[PDB]
Amino acid sequence: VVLRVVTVLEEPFVMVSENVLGKPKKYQGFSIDVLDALSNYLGFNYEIYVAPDHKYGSPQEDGTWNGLVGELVFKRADIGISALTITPDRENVVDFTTRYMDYSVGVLLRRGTSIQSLQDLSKQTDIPYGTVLDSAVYQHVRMKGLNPFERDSMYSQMWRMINRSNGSENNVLESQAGIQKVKYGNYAFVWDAAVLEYVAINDPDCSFYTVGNTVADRGYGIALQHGSPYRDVFSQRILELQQSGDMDILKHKWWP
Numbered sequence: 001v002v003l004r005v006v007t008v009l010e011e012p013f014v015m016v017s018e019n020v021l022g023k024p025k026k027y028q029g030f031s032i033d034v035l036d037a038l039s040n041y042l043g044f045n046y047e048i049y050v051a052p053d054h055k056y057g058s059p060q061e062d063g064t065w066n067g068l069v070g071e072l073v074f075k076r077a078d079i080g081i082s083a084l085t086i087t088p089d090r091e092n093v094v095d096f097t098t099r100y101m102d103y104s105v106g107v108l109l110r111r112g113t114s115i116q117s118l119q120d121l122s123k124q125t126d127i128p129y130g131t132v133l134d135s136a137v138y139q140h141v142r143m144k145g146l147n148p149f150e151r152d153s154m155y156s157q158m159w160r161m162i163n164r165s166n167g168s169e170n171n172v173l174e175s176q177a178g179i180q181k182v183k184y185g186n187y188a189f190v191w192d193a194a195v196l197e198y199v200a201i202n203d204p205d206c207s208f209y210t211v212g213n214t215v216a217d218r219g220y221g222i223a224l225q226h227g228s229p230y231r232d233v234f235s236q237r238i239l240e241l242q243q244s245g246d247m248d249i250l251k252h253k254w255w256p
């Protein structure tokens, strides 16, 4: 029994280890190890392909979904292995396992800063900051900073910085671009805290520092087709990995 796995590249969750003839051959990462834990225990083999648009998946004008979620809806893949945020929107078109990673937001800073939190970052302007355009972080700051019900001045000030020149000045098109901008410029990059911790830990110049708060009731899960016969056993195994302390060994392999 061979499963077809769709993924989205995101260090250190899913990283392409080897390319042959212009296509990835081997994948590694925390999400890959969780997949390898499921495959060996439940007794299935798999093959992995990257989502063509490199997107996670969001609803479109016409109802259809794009990205990884779209690949599962159109049944072009059986399961999705990535840092895919569990949302009610997505739970309506694909089946999610239980959470295997906690959602977290953080900021990447040049070595030698006073910034301790996202709160601090919002209260200064000397270090410009931003994220990836139209990403999760971006859309959250935009929503909170434009919501008349919200009166947390942090999201209002952050959106003011992020949306300078309609977002062309302080944002980037890829996370790699944001990281290099911190490395070689005066900039702070807001992203998933777990990603940024991996980046900081592994930078050859050790030029980064990172702070971030985790977010409860938010996290990443494995996705499957709607009405998949594999969800329940997938979710059970994830619990088992958690109780046995196997998940904390995987997390320590990538976040020592």
Ligand SMILES: O=C(O)c1cc(=O)c2ccc(Cl)cc2[nH]1
Pocket (backbone or CB within 6 Å): 010, 013, 056, 057, 083, 084, 085, 135, 136, 137, 191, 192, 195
């Ligand atoms: O699942 C999503 O929609 C999604 C959007 C992001 O910008 C993102 C960024 C970093 C990580 Cl580790 C996961 C992410 N997931």
Ligand SMILES: O=C(O)c1cc(=O)c2ccc(Cl)cc2[nH]1
Pocket (backbone or CB within 6 Å): 105, 118, 136, 137, 138, 140, 141, 158, 190, 213, 214, 215
């Ligand atoms: O602390 C939270 O609940 C939280 C959730 C987000 O999605 C988020 C996104 C961007 C920024 Cl700059 C802060 C954030 N904080």
Ligand SMILES: O=C(O)c1cc(=O)c2ccc(Cl)cc2[nH]1
Pocket (backbone or CB within 6 Å): 171, 172, 173, 177, 178, 180, 181, 184, 185
């Ligand atoms: O792709 C971008 O928006 C971008 C902005 C920078 O300031 C920048 C600075 C250095 C490097 Cl190596 C890449 C960069 N990329």
Ligand SMILES: [Cl-]
Pocket (backbone or CB within 6 Å): 039, 044, 045, 046, 047
């Ligand atoms: Cl395999």
